[PDB]
């Protein structure tokens, strides 16, 4: 089958650029689009993410959306300017400038069709479309505006396909805009209703991980995006080669969403260690699960141990004993029975793929549906409230035709989300 990858906004584009680096490397694809890998399984499911153009040129099944020419230019000027197809570069009038209404409601709305036409072109090149993956920020304006804008449009076209997104969440201590709550609140309002699964990633959390575990002196965005891309791959890596237990976006959703609306997930990645500490690694399934269930290795800022686990997905990579894995899963649930939600018998869904990440002997990725995430929503809601009570910055959206009712409705609906997570926590 095939999956469409859409990138929206500078943040999403930079993450996606790193993502396509990673998986192109994974599948033996060079900077011309030519295949020079050593395995045959790299071509077994290459169709998932690549069109096979004449001459065996493999072309990212991806759409590049932005409203700020220049970022798009940096993409074309980068190593994958020879990889991405030119008619997938969609941009026009200047960007929203952190104005969600410009991104979703007005200026971005004008260019929707120029995206959807490409969506259709991509769809009709597929043998079986499984779903969509959106990569964007949750506060940027364009990425968050065009994000939910396109999500709505795409679902209208493909209501029965899987809507997946990787969203960068407003972090307590890592900012760059004072309307981050306005944009996030307006975005999530439409996100929930039109999304099947969404991942919440905090730059702050990554900033912590990239030092606490990776000991990076100068953690750059390219390193934080790199962490993200690793988990992005893991989510769908099971679809691209053989394994003892298969997995899927649908399979995950079936085992990760117990209550329709609660489809917000925390992502994590196994072996996190600095290059000087790698020599002390055991590389065992035990070791991996110690990291996977370590709160400090979660890429959401909220620490899971303030909430409970509605359900967990543990996707493993490489040769390993199925019993060994099962044993560790049991040990974990026995260890922290107070953390796992008792309403679920087996709180952990597992999967095991036969191929580790090139260069690793054995890896894994972690997807958690915890109730703790409600606290991130609370924090943002409070920031939103404080500003909204004074109608701060409201005229930036008023001038685009946005009323107060939307903002109060969104917040009311945000409260419902938190309330639901609290409903299912003791």
């Amino acid at each position: 089958r095939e999956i469409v990858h859409i990138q929206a906004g500078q943040c999403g584009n930079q993450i996606g650029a790193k993502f396509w680096e990673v998986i192109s490397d994974e599948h033996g694809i060079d900077p011309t689009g030519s295949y020079h890998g050593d395995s045959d399984l790299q071509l077994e499911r290459i169709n998932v993410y690549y069109n096979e153009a004449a001459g065996n040129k493999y072309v990212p099944r991806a759409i590049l959306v932005d409203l700020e020419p220049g970022t798009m230019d940096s993409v074309r000027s980068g190593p994958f300017g020879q990889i991405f197809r030119p008619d997938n570069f969609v941009f026009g009038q200047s960007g929203a400038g952190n104005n969600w209404a410009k991104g979703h409601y007005t200026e971005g709305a004008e260019l929707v069709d120029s995206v959807l036409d490409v969506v259709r072109k991509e769809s009709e090149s597929c043998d079986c479309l499984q779903g969509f993956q959106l990569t964007h920020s949750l506060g940027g304006g364009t990425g968050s505006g065009m994000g939910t804008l396109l999500i709505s449009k795409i679902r209208e076209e493909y209501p029965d396909r899987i809507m997946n997104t990787f969203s960068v969440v407003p972090s307590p201590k890592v900012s760059d805009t004072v309307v981050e709550p306005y944009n996030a609140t307006l975005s999530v309002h439409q996100l929930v209703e039109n999304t099947d699964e969404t991942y919440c990633i905090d730059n702050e959390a990554l900033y912590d991980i990239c030092f606490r575990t990776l000991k990076l002196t100068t953690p750059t965005y390219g390193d934080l995006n790199h962490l993200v891309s690793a988990t992005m791959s893991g989510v769908t890596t099971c679809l691209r080669f053989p394994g003892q237990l298969n997995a899927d976006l649908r399979k995950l959703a079936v085992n990760m969403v117990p209550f329709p609306r609660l489809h917000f997930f925390m992502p994590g990645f196994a072996p996190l260690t600095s290059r000087g500490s790698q020599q002390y690694r055991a590389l065992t399934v035990p070791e991996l699960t110690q990291q996977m269930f370590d709160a400090k290795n979660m890429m959401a800022a909220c620490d899971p141990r303030h909430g409970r686990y509605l359900t967990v997905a543990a996707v493993f990579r490489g040769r390993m004993s199925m019993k060994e894995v099962d044993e560790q899963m049991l040990n974990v649930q026995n260890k922290n029975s107070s953390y796992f939600v008792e309403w679920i018998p087996n709180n952990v869904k597992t999967a095991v793929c036969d191929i580790p990440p090139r260069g690793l002997k054995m890896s894994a990725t972690f997807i958690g549906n915890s109730t703790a995430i409600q606290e991130l929503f609370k924090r943002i809601s409070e920031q939103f409230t404080a500003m909204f009570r004074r109608k701060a910055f409201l005229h930036w959206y008023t001038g685009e035709g946005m009323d107060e009712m939307e903002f109060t409705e969104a917040e009311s609906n945000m409260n419902d989300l938190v309330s639901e997570y609290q409903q299912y926590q003791d």
């Binding site: 020419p69 970022t71 760059d176 500003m387």
Partner: protein, 427 residues
Amino acid sequence: RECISIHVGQAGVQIGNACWELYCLEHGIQPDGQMPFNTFFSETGAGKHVPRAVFVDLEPTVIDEVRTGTYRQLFHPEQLITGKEDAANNYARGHYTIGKEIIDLVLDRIRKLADQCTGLQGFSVFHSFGGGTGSGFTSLLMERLSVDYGKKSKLEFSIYPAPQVSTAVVEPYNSILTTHTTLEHSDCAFMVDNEAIYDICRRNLDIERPTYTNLNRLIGQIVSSITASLRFDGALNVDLTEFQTNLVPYPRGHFPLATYAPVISAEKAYHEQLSVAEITNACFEPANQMVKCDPRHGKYMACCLLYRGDVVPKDVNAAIATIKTKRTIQFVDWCPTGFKVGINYEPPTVVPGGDLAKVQRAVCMLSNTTAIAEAWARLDHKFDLMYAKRAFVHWYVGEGMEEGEFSEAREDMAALEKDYEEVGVDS
């Protein structure tokens, strides 16, 4: 992504000289326009790229200095608009009798530039409050320009009638009359005090004898970091309207202070070891404010920090966290945060024959605060006093400026002051 610059009276022009010198230095552009950037220079097939600028002076003098001096070959002759008789420190004459005689030409030249310009973002006006050719004419022009381009961003970089010392005695009048136009038509205004700068030159650059040349260079350097910086492609390319998105919370309050925290002498460049936190900290010290204002007696509404050269986001975030930890400076209670960050990859601009020593990184701060509002009270007193005696009133009445206009101008200024009071108090 392109913009148009506007220069009026003498001050606007002299400041412009510094600005366009910097832009030339940045892009390697020669005095005849030759390059051996398109947002400041219109592309020329011969390589002689020409400044997107309009120069206005009702007495050609300062423009003649440009016409005869260096960069006469840089600028297009059509751009060098001059009059015959000056406004002579009279807002009303600059607004009406004299200014209106060339405003048609001015708008026509602007139109040509705007027709040439594809992705016009907005304008950057350089003016004062002292002279009428700056104050009055700008008032006229901004109204006209606002009508033609209601959808384009209008920046105003003004030289604030300093509270301590000035050079004309009828400034209060010209200043207060300007206020109700700028507040009405501008999208974002900056107020700069020459005396605050001279003080900065003394303390930081170690200059006992400072003049407009060096003073202007500092101002221009700030503008480069505000604007041109974005056009070099950095990590965080904060748009000009994105500035407004985050800096401005209301329909008004368009008065950010623009500071530059790498101000440093050549001697200090050897002994001083600067970095992200050090420089960032310096910009919040009531010394490099670029205006007679002490932030510690007000609150911060919003603060955009623009970085250049060798910086990383980690250190920037850490410095900000330290600032919020410091808690000495107060922030608006209903503003969860107020920090925004822009980051370049291109280093700071160095002026051959300047003083501001070469550094590996730079920080500009664009801050909205309630403290600055106090400066207008000082102007109010100066105005009220002279107004009470109707001193010099006959120079404006001789134009026909309605006496009631002065009372109205004051009320609009007072409204602005009141708004800032409410911002700080309310929660």
